């Protein structure tokens, strides 16, 4: 034998460490954001609509095929990302239909909640209920084991059109300097959490063991009063679910501090578990003067200690306490090159295997393999790190044969593992959702 790679050593240690918990969930309910992502060459679509190349020109809202063409060309010229709302409902239906029917266009389950539901549904001994704006195409796309209440089924889907271009791609006088994408939709359902009532209404009959909620971030840019109504609906609904049923909030894509503040004040005490990435974590610390609020942006890989100080602070400021009457005891942090599972001691079991399992799915799903293909992955976590930047904490060195690292801090345990990052990924949109679902699947509430 020759020496195995760090990655093969690590994936072998995971396969030995990972096992389902002693007591397993039977039924999980998930809501409420869901859509169909249609990924298509932007130039091809526009050509397919019968459009000749016009001028690049930005438009704040797309009212028309012209506006679409003009803003697309503008961003294609920059090689830059953008996203827009398309205002004409009927015209949008015809464009999305044209994109979805275009030969070679790819169709994907979209929306945090639907993606979570889909990941859970891969296990046949777990029964999944999913609510959200689910039309005939999304229903077809969803796994057969996923139950959607007839109440949550609708005539039309929410299509999100993802218009890609390659570096060096040309259309008449236009040439993309980088590969990127232009996304547009006409999605009022997900913006308003219009299926929250239907979701809440379905829980009693279903008797979930676990409730998972996502989609709050999508209300960004809606009426503050509409947001306030929905957050109160969330909190009321959760107070009606039987005691001891964990609720996980998957928090993504936030830029509004009023809304973030409100989610922290109102929803955090009502949930057992929280899931998020480096972007939302730092955003939280920026709003409420947290450990590294001073930090404007992560400078490369987020510093583990700095991350852990913020997770610590959240469970201290907003987690369960003798005095507080918060239910929050768990945060599944996931970033590109490592994941951390942080738990208030004595409320959760199997968190070594769970964080390992979250990390493993990040590799396999990114590469679109059933198991880890050790040729297509790469260990990118720091070789050594401090467990707290602000406080004095341990100096840890990565051992591929013992990848899951545990450390304790004032009655809160952290569980760290690196990720085996897919070097040549198919598509990594929705990875955080599959990571959080896997982490919860392998978790046990005490």
UniProtKB/Swiss-Prot annotation:
Which residues are named in the active-site annotation? 433 (proton acceptor)
GO cellular component terms listed in the entry, alphabetical order: extracellular region
Q: Where does Mg(2+) bind?
A: 250, 280, 433
Cofactor(s) for this UniProt protein? Mg(2+)
Give residue ranges for domain ADPK: 5-446
What Gene3D superfamilies would the database entry show? 3.40.1190.20
Q: Which reactions are catalysed by this chain?
A: D-glucose + ADP = D-glucose 6-phosphate + AMP + H(+)
Quote the subcellular location field of this record.
Answer: Secreted
Q: Which biological process terms from the Gene Ontology are attached to this UniProt entry? A: glucose metabolic process; glycolytic process
Q: In which pathway does it act?
A: Carbohydrate degradation; glycolysis
- The keyword Metal-binding is annotated on this UniProt entry: yes
- Please verify whether the record's keywords include Transport: no
GO MF annotations, alphabetized:
ADP-specific glucokinase activity; metal ion binding
The alphabetical list of record keywords is: Glycolysis, Kinase, Magnesium, Metal-binding, Secreted, Signal, Transferase
> What pH-related activity note exists for this entry?
Optimum pH is 5.75-6.5 and 8.75-9.0.
Query: What Enzyme Commission number does this protein have?
Result: 2.7.1.147
Record's cofactor remark? Binds 1 Mg(2+) ion per subunit.
Q: EC class of this enzyme?
A: transferase
Tell me the superkingdom of the source. Eukaryota
In the record, the note on similarity to other proteins reads: Belongs to the ADP-dependent glucokinase family.
The free-text function statement in the UniProt record for this protein reads: Catalyzes the phosphorylation of D-glucose to D-glucose 6-phosphate using ADP as the phosphate donor. GDP and CDP can replace ADP, but with reduced efficiency.
Q: Which PANTHER family match?
A: ADP-DEPENDENT GLUCOKINASE
Subunit relationships: Monomer.
Name the UniProt record assigns to this protein:
ADP-dependent glucokinase
Q: Which organism is it from?
A: Mus musculus (Mouse)
Q: What is the lineage of its organism?
A: Eukaryota, Metazoa, Chordata, Craniata, Vertebrata
């Amino acid at each position: 034998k020759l020496a195995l790679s760090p990655e093969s050593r690590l994936a072998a240690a995971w396969d030995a460490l990972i096992a389902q918990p002693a007591r397993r969930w039977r039924r999980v309910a998930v809501g409420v954001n869901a859509c169909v992502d249609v990924v298509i060459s932007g130039v091809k679509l526009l050509q397919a609509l019968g459009l000749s190349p016009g001028s690049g020109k930005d438009h704040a809202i797309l009212h028309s095929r012209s506006d679409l063409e003009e803003a697309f060309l503008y961003f294609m010229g920059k090689g830059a990302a953008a996203e827009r709302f398309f205002s004409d409902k009927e015209t949008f239906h015809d464009i999305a239909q044209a994109a979805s029917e275009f030969p070679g266009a790819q169709h994907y389950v979209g929306g945090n909640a639907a993606l979570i539901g889909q990941r859970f549904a891969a296990n046949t001994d777990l029964k999944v209920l999913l609510c959200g704006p689910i039309g005939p195409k999304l229903h077809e796309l969803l796994d057969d084991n996923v139950f959607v209440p007839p109440e949550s089924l609708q005539e039309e889907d929410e299509f999100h059109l993802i218009l890609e271009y390659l570096a060096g791609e040309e259309w008449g006088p236009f040439k993309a300097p980088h590969a990127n994408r232009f996304i547009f939709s006409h999605d009022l359902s997900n913006g308003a959490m219009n299926m929250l009532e239907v979701f809440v209404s379905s829980l009693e009959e279903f008797q979930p063991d676990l409730v998972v909620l996502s989609g709050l971030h999508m209300m960004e840019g809606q009426s503050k009063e509409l947001q306030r109504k929905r957050l109160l609906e969330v909190v009321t609904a959760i107070s009606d679910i039987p005691t001891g049923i964990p609720v996980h909030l998957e928090l993504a894509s936030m830029t509004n501090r009023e809304l973030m503040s409100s989610i922290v004040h109102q929803v955090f005490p009502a949930v057992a578990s929280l899931g998020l990435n480096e972007q939302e974590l730092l955003f939280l610390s920026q709003s409420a003067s947290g450990p590294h609020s001073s930090l404007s942006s992560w400078d490369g890989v987020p510093d583990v200690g700095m991350v852990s100080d913020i997770l610590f602070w959240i469970l201290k400021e907003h987690g369960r306490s003798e005095n507080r009457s918060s239910d929050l005891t768990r945060i599944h942090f996931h970033t590109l090159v490592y994941h951390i599972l942080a738990t208030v001691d004595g409320h959760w079991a199997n968190q070594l295997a769970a964080v390992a399992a979250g990390a493993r799915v990040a590799g396999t799903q990114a590469c679109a393999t059933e198991t880890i293909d050790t040729n297509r992955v790469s260990l990118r976590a720091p070789q050594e790190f401090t467990t707290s930047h602000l406080e004095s904490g341990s100096r840890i060195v990565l051992n591929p044969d013992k990848p899951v690292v545990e450390w304790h801090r004032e009655g809160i345990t952290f569980h760290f593992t690196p990720v085996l990052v897919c070097k040549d990924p198919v598509r990594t949109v929705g990875l955080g959702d599959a990571i959080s679902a896997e982490g919860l699947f392998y978790s046990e509430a005490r």
